[PDB]
């Protein structure tokens, strides 16, 4: 096929190898925390002390699986703070040095993250592994940047859809494999996928930013440092607005508006998506195995919609499809929030899947069309960073309201707040 097919193919297979490696360990995390608690790990005990303080503050009942999910949520949140910190820098660096050298630095970091975990099963090794993997998770935003390097709006909108399929397939099949593996072998499979991704990208990712299109600098002074690290400067896209041939006027307002909608969407969606672990236990007494089955079906529907519908939306129709998805999430979360049987829960999950499939891909696709050739890493790095900030705060704030106000209070209120990104877009 053309050179555009070849790059997206390499980006997709690389990213799927990456996401299998990460998601593989997620169904095992409950057992690994429980092991540390049971060995009296005094560092574990520190963090358990923090989760406890939080559990007391929000009024969360004392129960093994409620603790497991809350601890997994603090851990998930700390990790997203690392992704937020590093995504703009990694982007700006690649704008200046090319996509391939920075993609490869990031993958050596991810491979090293799994080398560490492989060697030691302590809470310390766990956090050391998460820290390194966290600061090296720019490979994700570099994938979106590489798609944004492509020539046509069509190339880009389909590229972002294909990345959507990677995340949906990765988050589906990874935990499936992990729970099928003997625990000893799991960190070895993560390593195999992470080393495979590194080697695959080394041999097959073509460069999509030529030397004569690159940003002259990463950051010259403290104001440029702050442009990559301040949540408000990342919302205002100040790093992009201060680059070579940047967007200005109406074009720069639009970029900011898509970013605010992106952040708000993911703040709300990531919160309800996390607290669905509370709702399916508390209301329907789902085992974590049954939560496995449910997220599996969600991921498969999402990959189908992403591959089949999201990927076929005519360039120019991204925004119309996002507005329709944000409206669909109002009934979707009302049905989940209030449903007292599996048919009603099921209907809300189906709408959840159709709507979530479209939003991240369609918005990335429109955002990717902004910035000059040497700013694609800074634009998509800034977008990923806003998502990371959103997935950092979303779970914690939804957990507070879920336990302080109850499932209905949280799911009704978050449902209402979806009209904020809907109206910001219209």
Ligand X SMILES: CCCCCCCC/C=C\CCCCCCCC(=O)OC[C@H](O)CO
Whole-Å CA distances, 406 to 73, 263, 282, 352? 18, 24, 11, 20
Decide: is 28 part of the binding site for ligand X (CB under 6 A).
no
Residues 6+ apart with CB under 8 A from 46: none
Minimum distance between the CB of residue 34 and ligand X, rounded to whole angstroms?
Answer: 15
Q: Nearer to ligand X by C-beta: 49 or 216?
A: 49
Q: Nearer to ligand X by C-beta: 124 or 409?
A: 124
Minimum distance between the CB of residue 116 and ligand X, rounded to whole angstroms?
Answer: 5
Q: Nearer to ligand X by C-beta: 46 or 119?
A: 119
Most distant CA pair in the chain, distance = 60
Q: Nearer to ligand X by C-beta: 191 or 327?
A: 191
Among all residues, whose Cβ is closest to ligand X?
120
Kindly determine how many residues on this chain lie close enough to bind ligand X according to the rule CB under 6 A: 10
Whole-Å CA distances, 214 to 88, 146, 211, 218, 222? 16, 13, 6, 10, 21
Minimum distance between the CB of residue 130 and ligand X, rounded to whole angstroms?
Answer: 11
Minimum distance between the CB of residue 43 and ligand X, rounded to whole angstroms?
Answer: 8
Binding mask 83-122 for ligand X (x = CB under 6 A): -----------------------------x--xx--xxxx
Q: Nearer to ligand X by C-beta: 75 or 115?
A: 115
- Interaction with ligand X in 121-150: which residues (CB under 6 A)? 121-122, 124-125, 128
Q: Nearer to ligand X by C-beta: 9 or 119?
A: 119
Minimum distance between the CB of residue 71 and ligand X, rounded to whole angstroms?
Answer: 18
Q: Nearer to ligand X by C-beta: 109 or 271?
A: 109
Minimum distance between the CB of residue 255 and ligand X, rounded to whole angstroms?
Answer: 36
Contact 407, 278 (CB under 8 A): yes
Minimum distance between the CB of residue 100 and ligand X, rounded to whole angstroms?
Answer: 19
Neighbours of 68 (CB within 10 A): 18
Minimum distance between the CB of residue 120 and ligand X, rounded to whole angstroms?
Answer: 3
The alpha carbon of 136 is separated from its chain's Cα centroid by a whole number of angstroms, namely 14
Torsion over CA of 100, 194, 147 and 273, rounded to 10 degrees?
-140
Q: Nearer to ligand X by C-beta: 136 or 280?
A: 136
Minimum distance between the CB of residue 83 and ligand X, rounded to whole angstroms?
Answer: 20
Contact 410, 397 (CB under 8 A): no
Q: Nearer to ligand X by C-beta: 112 or 372?
A: 112
- Residues in contact with ligand X by CB under 6 A are 112, 115-116, 119-122, 124-125, 128
């Amino acid at each position: 096929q053309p050179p555009e097919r070849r790059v997206v193919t390499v980006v997709f297979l690389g990213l799927l190898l990456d996401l299998l490696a990460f998601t593989l360990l997620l169904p095992l995390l409950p057992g690994l925390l429980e092991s540390h608690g049971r060995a009296h790990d005094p560092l574990y005990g520190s963090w358990q002390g923090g989760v406890d303080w939080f559990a007391t503050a929000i009024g969360m009942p004392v129960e093994k699986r409620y603790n497991s999910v809350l601890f997994g949520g603090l851990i998930g949140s700390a990790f997203s703070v690392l992704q937020f910190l590093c995504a703009p820098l990694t982007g700006a660096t690649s704008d200046c040095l090319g996509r391939r050298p920075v993609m490869l630095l990031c993958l050596m970091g991810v491979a090293t993250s799994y080398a560490v975990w492989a060697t030691s099963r302590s809470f310390a090794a766990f956090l050391a592994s998460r820290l390194i993997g966290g600061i090296s998770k720019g490979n994700v935003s570099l994938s979106t940047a590489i798609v944004a390097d492509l020539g046509s709006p069509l190339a880009r909108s389909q590229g972002m859809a294909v990345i959507g399929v990677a995340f949906s397939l990765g988050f589906t099949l990874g935990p499936m494999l992990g729970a099928s593996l003997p625990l000893e072998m799991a960190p070895w499979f993560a390593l195999l996928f992470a080393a495979s991704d590194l080697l695959f990208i080394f041999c097959f990712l073509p460069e999509t930013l030529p030397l004569e299109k690159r940003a002259p600098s990463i950051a010259l002074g403290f104001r440029d440092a702050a442009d990559l690290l301040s949540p408000l400067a990342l919302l205002r896209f100040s790093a992009v607005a201060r680059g070579q041939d940047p967007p200005s006027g109406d074009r720069l307002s639009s970029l900011r508006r898509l970013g605010l909608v992106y952040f708000l969407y993911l703040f709300l969606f990531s919160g309800l998506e996390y607290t669905l672990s509370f709702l399916t236990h508390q209301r329907f007494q789902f085992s974590s195995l049954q939560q496995g089955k449910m997220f599996f079906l969600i991921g498969l529907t999402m990959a189908t919609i992403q591959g089949a519908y999201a990927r076929r939306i005519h360039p120019g129709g991204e925004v119309a499809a996002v507005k329709r998805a944000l409206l669909l999430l109002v009934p979707a979360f009302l049905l989940i929030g209030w449903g007292r049987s599996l048919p009603v829960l099921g209907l809300g999950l189906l709408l959840y899947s159709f709507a979530a499939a479209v939003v991240v891909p369609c918005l990335s696709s429109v955002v990717a069309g902004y910035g000059s050739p040497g700013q694609k890493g800074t634009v998509m790095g800034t977008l990923r960073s806003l998502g990371a900030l959103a997935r950092a705060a979303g779970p914690l704030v939804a957990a507070s309201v879920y336990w302080l106000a109850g499932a209905q209070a949280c799911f009704t209120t978050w449902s209402g707040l979806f009209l904020l990104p809907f109206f910001l877009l219209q």
